[PDB]
UniProtKB/Swiss-Prot annotation:
UniProt comment concerning the protein's domains: The T-Box domain binds to double-stranded DNA.
GO BP term (any one): positive regulation of secondary heart field cardioblast proliferation
Keywords: Acetylation, Cytoplasm, Developmental protein, DNA-binding, Nucleus, Transcription, Transcription regulation
Part of the whole protein covered: 53 to 238 of 518
Name of the protein: T-box transcription factor TBX5
Feature: DNA-binding region: 58-226
Purpose of the protein: DNA-binding protein that regulates the transcription of several genes and is involved in heart development and limb pattern formation. Binds to the core DNA motif of NPPA promoter.
Gene Ontology MF: a single term: DNA binding
GO cellular component, one term: protein-DNA complex
Signal peptide: none
Subunit text: Monomer. Homodimer (via the T-box); binds DNA as homodimer. Interacts (via the T-box) with NKX2-5 (via the homeobox); this complex binds DNA. Interacts with GATA4. Interacts with KAT2A and KAT2B.
DNA sequence: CTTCTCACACCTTTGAAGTGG
DNA sequence: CCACTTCAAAGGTGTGAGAA
């Protein structure tokens, strides 16, 4: 059998781990009863938990260029859909002490509405009023510049929806419309744009070349290879 | 005639508990 | 305590036929 913890239990365990890396029997016991768990489960968790001018760099840019020169298409679902390739970046030139906030947003590329026929995209009208507006704040926000610069920053959890009445907080886009992602860095007491990451939101794939590019590169689509 | 929705097979990832050091 | 690994559920993908 498999046992899962509550978002509450996990979060509280996470909040303490960010304060203390090790616990003592009394510290372990008191937390367990608060979390309505046994001391052993808490014990195991912490053991398990222990392992594992500003310049921004888009990693795996090569894969984006592969998609880019073909015409980047992105699937949007009512429930929300991941971006492939994943928007991972490395940031440098930050203040180690200063706390920052990383977030993403996706703005319209143009003012046209496209369609795909005979291996060709064509403006078949004006862009629909793209509303409302939503941002994607990175989970690790807010954190010090030292944390952001420590390793890569992954925006892979970002999900895309076509549901204008989405109750989950995913960035809402209009299907059959071209879009451009933007990275923003803010403080607490700069915008970086990559034209190659520009895409078109779709409800289903058009050019199978894009489709083939995804399958041979997306680990989850490994079930569809020859 | 276009564009969007859904179950299902197939896959990776995840996390707590297990084992031995 | 470490560092591995089980093991089953969770989650991500695209496909194809049907739906507004």
């Amino acid at each position: 059998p498999r046992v899962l913890f509550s978002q509450a239990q996990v979060y509280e365990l996470e909040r303490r781990f960010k304060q203390q890396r090790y616990l003592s029997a009394p510290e372990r016991d008191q937390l367990a009863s608060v979390l309505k768990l046994t001391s052993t489960q808490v014990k195991i968790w912490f053991q398990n938990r222990r392992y594992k001018g500003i310049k921004v760099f888009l990693h795996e840019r090569e894969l984006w260029l592969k998609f880019h020169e073909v015409g980047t298409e992105m699937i949007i679902t009512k429930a929300g859909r991941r971006m492939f390739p994943s928007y991972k970046v490395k940031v440098t030139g930050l203040n180690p002490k200063t706390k920052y906030i990383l977030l993403m947003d996706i703005v319209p590329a143009d003012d046209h509405r496209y369609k795909f026929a005979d291996n060709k995209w064509s403006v078949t009208g004006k862009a629909e009023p793209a509303m409302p507006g939503r941002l994607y704040v990175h989970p690790d926000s807010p954190a010090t510049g030292a944390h952001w610069m420590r390793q890569l920053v992954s925006f892979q959890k970002l999900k895309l929806t076509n549901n204008h009445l989405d109750p989950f907080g995913h960035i809402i886009l209009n299907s059959m419309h071209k879009y451009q992602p933007r990275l923003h860095i803010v403080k607490a007491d700069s915008t970086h744009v990559f034209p190659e990451t520009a895409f078109i939101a779709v409800t289903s794939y058009q050019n199978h070349k894009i489709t083939q590019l995804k399958i041979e590169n997306n680990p989850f689509a490994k079930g569809f290879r020859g």
